[PDB]
Amino acid sequence: TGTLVLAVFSAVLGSLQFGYNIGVINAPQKVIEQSYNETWLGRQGPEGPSSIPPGTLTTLWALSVAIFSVGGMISSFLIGIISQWLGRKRAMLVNNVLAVLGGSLMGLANAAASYEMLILGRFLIGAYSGLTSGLVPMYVGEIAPTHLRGALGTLNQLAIVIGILIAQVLGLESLLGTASLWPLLLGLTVLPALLQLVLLPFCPESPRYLYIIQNLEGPARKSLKRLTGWADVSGVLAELKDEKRKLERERPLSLLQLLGSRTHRQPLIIAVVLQLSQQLSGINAVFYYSTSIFETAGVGQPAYATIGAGVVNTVFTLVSVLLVERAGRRTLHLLGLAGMCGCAILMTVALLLLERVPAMSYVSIVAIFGFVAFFEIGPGPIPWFIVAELFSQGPRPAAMAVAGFSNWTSNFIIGMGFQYVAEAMGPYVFLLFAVLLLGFFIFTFLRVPETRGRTFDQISAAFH
Ligand SMILES: C=C1[C@@H](C)[C@H]2[C@H](Cc3ccccc3)NC(=O)[C@]23OC(=O)/C=C\[C@H](O)CCC[C@@H](C)C/C=C/[C@H]3[C@@H]1O
Ligand SMILES: *[C@@H]1O[C@H](CO)[C@@H](O[C@@H]2O[C@H](CO)[C@@H](O)[C@H](O)[C@H]2NC(C)=O)[C@H](O)[C@H]1NC(C)=O
């Protein structure tokens, strides 16, 4: 099993970088912004009014995050062609080259006295994150033996949340996240990638790609032998043959082909809306700007509350992994949406009443965890389960891509928008989220079927 654990470790490193890049931006905000101010003057010089105008600074920061999201969008398109063209191991190695480039670009920003470098590096690391999110679950699913798929599936989510937590604690004022060393955080994401790059070459090649696509059996047999370790792997390749037959009897549809098939619409729309509900809920607000929200809410020390949100996210990630096994899909999503809406109407009230009762900050504090809590129960994992079980074997891949694209695009909006909205609306920002959640809830409650313990067969009938 040694090769198995090593390969799963490499995949987990990929997911860990992905999570770290998701969450590293939150803590150093009030330091990176001051650095931006510093460079923008260094540039202007004699005319400078002794301060970067707030509009430009807000725009640059919102760009610094929305560009991660844009790299994700661009990543959603390619996830397929390269996977079939180069494979999985080679794909992760090249994609790690991209990761190293992006991390170096982000790290060398301040020394270069320019912030365009940081934004470009964030674009590169967004492409990294999208590619690894696409390629890691696939690889672990290929290598995973017949009966450990369920155990390893939750690893791709445990790793992401743990990475968010690590980046969330590695940004304290005393820790790396200070004026002189902040680039180290944005540079730390170079180190694990290098490690992966120096570990993967020893790791095996996913048998399914090797046999199904490149139609070599001998190397597939060798990879299987070094993966599971049995003397003979006749049974697993015999099983591979039947799914080869199934794939050749159902050629996956093309993206424009899939969008052009009237039969697949009602499923498709469902998927897309779910992703919006997962994204336009407003969780990425809590993942990116939670330090600023807490500081606005009057919290005593926003950074500690930020790590608190991270740890609650992790705890209820594990709880959801325990739950989804024995609860359902539709019910979990409705519960999560309803919980997030009331929790955000609490937070709105807490902000609105902060002046009158100073202790309300604690309320706000707890509210956010509740928010995060509920997100990890219903809409965190579930939309992906619904999408996966909604579509047949053939048209699943293309559909996935579209969902991913939507999941990224919505993200961009929130990632790019929140700050402006935060300034325009006031305390009521989360109230907007509540309305959106309420909307989605109603739609879900009356439109999405129940996929757990159901045949694609019946589901199709349910849509009819
Ligand atoms: C808040 C977010 C972060 C925190 C995660 C969040 C938690 C999660 C992670 C992993 C699986 C299921 C749920 N729920 C997510 O959906 C999450 O992560 C992913 O989707 C990651 C990989 C997927 O297997 C393929 C899609 C990967 C991308 C196409 C979409 C990524 C979504 C992010 C999301 O931005
Ligand atoms: C941007 O940089 C300038 C200069 O470093 C900051 O100006 C200092 O700001 C503090 C607090 O506002 C004042 O007490 C100092 O007198 C200012 N020094 C100078 C030389 O002007 C400015 O505040 C910064 N603004 C932002 C938004 O970062």
Residue numbers in the entry: 21 to 484
Authors' description from the paper:
The major facilitator superfamily (MFS) glucose transporter GLUT4 mediates the rate-limiting glucose cellular uptake in adipocytes and muscle cells, and thus plays a vital role in insulin-responsive glucose metabolism. At basal state, GLUT4 is primarily distributed on the membranes of the trans-Golgi network (TGN), endosomes and 50–70 nm tubulo-vesicular structures known as the GLUT4 storage vesicles (GSVs). Upon insulin stimulation, GLUT4 is quickly transported from these intracellular structures to the plasma membrane, resulting in rapid consumption of glucose from blood. Among the SLC2A members, GLUT4 is most closely related to GLUT1, with a sequence identity and similarity of 65% and 79%, respectively.
We also successfully reconstituted the purified GLUT4 into nanodiscs of POPC plus cholesterol surrounded by the membrane scaffold protein MSP1D1. The elution volume of nanodisc-embedded GLUT4 is slightly earlier than β-NG. To stabilize the structure of GLUT4, 1 mM CCB was added to the purified proteins. Following our previously developed “guided multi-reference 3D classification” and “seed”-facilitated 3D classification strategy, the resolutions of GLUT4 embedded in the LMNG/CHS micelles and nanodiscs both reached 3.3 Å after several rounds of 3D classification and refinement by cryoSPARC. In the structure of GLUT4, the amino terminal domain (NTD, containing TMs 1-6) and carboxyl terminal domain (CTD, containing TMs 7-12) enclose a large cavity that opens to the intracellular side, a state defined as inward-open (left). CCB is accommodated in the big cleft between the NTD and CTD. The macrolide ring of CCB is coordinated by Asn176 and Trp404 through polar interactions, and Phe38, Trp404, and Trp428 through hydrophobic interaction. In the cryo-EM map for GLUT4, a characteristic glycan density is observed contiguous with Asn57, exemplifying the unique power of cryo-EM in resolving posttranslational modifications. The major distinction occurs to ICH5, which is invisible in the structure of GLUT1, but clearly resolved in the EM map of GLUT4. None of the GLUT4-unique sequences, 5FQQI8, 489LL490, and 498TELEY502, is visible, likely owing to the intrinsic flexibility of these segments.
